[PDB]
Design a protein around this ligand. Structure first.
Ligand SMILES: [Ca+2]
Lengths: 56, 222
């Protein structure tokens, strides 16, 4: 389950705000994404995040 | 920028901020209507902010101009990060002391050349702290071999390393797309690295001198 993986910033140096499902909190939270090599628990909006991972 | 210093208001006139509701990348003004940044900084709805110092408060020297076109290098590889370069056309030309363009290089810079790297990125190696004002860092260009030793099988002919093997001085998240200026010419674009300011892990930059022909021709036919 990729929804359980911790957020991955990656090697690139941009500061792009994305969402990840935080199973511990039971909600999608924001984190800083570097711009490349995103893993699957990385969404552009909270709605996409809840739809894909909500309740995992 | 980790381990740098406060540049001083508008002392880096070609530095721009790419804003999508907040600062997410830097860029360099090459002429009144064109900006060079990194390909991984591509986003829709980009607003370019020029003449910025404190990115959080309006100080008066600013010019906010939306992008009309964003051209990512045709051979950009999101997996290998090769050809990590992008051109952004401003919807209207900028009014050029606080806002000025930077020259493209005639030749590539050699290892050991001291360069100025700038940005509004994270200033902590372990931790988070984004500055209000523009930060600067003088770092030397490193040899191809040491760069390849630091990142085995990841360095292409289109990338170069710059910084310090000891760690503590580097570009970091939020600096991507920003300039690496040497001898008054734009030699690099902040791109990637393993963490920031680590270590034996210097920052990796897009080698601008290899794209000068492509840049000039692309600007001219768009
Ligand atoms: Ca400002």
């Amino acid at each position: 389950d990729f929804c359980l993986e911790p957020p991955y910033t990656g090697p690139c140096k941009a500061r792009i705000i994305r969402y990840f499902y935080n199973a511990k909190a039971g909600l999608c939270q924001t984190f800083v994404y570097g711009g490349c090599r995103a893993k699957r628990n990385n969404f552009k909006s909270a709605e996409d995040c809840m739809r894909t991972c909500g309740g995992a | 920028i980790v381990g740098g210093y406060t540049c001083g208001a508008n002392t880096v006139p070609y530095q721009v901020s790419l804003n999508s509701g907040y600062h997410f990348c830097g860029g360099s003004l090459i002429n009144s209507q064109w900006v060079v940044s990194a390909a991984h900084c591509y986003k829709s709805g980009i607003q370019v902010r020029l003449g910025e110092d404190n990115i959080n408060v309006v100080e008066g020297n600013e010019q906010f101009i939306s992008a009309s076109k964003s051209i990512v290098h045709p051979s950009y590889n999101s997996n290998t990060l090769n050809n990590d370069i992008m051109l952004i056309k401003l919807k209207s030309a900028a009014s050029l002391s606080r806002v000025a363009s930077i020259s493209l290089p005639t030749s590539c810079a050699s290892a050991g050349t001291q360069c100025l790297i700038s940005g509004w990125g994270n200033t902590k190696s372990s931790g988070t702290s984004y500055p209000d004002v523009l930060k600067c860092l003088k770092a030397p260009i490193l040899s191809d071999s040491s760069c390849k030793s630091a990142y085995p099988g990841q360095i292409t002919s289109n990338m170069f390393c710059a910084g310090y093997l000891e760690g503590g001085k580097d570009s970091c998240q939020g600096d991507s797309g920003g300039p690496v200026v040497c001898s008054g010419k734009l030699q690099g674009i902040v791109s990637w690295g393993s963490g920031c300011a680590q270590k034996n892990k210097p920052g990796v930059y897009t080698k601008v001198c290899n794209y000068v022909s492509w840049i000039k021709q692309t600007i001219a036919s768009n």
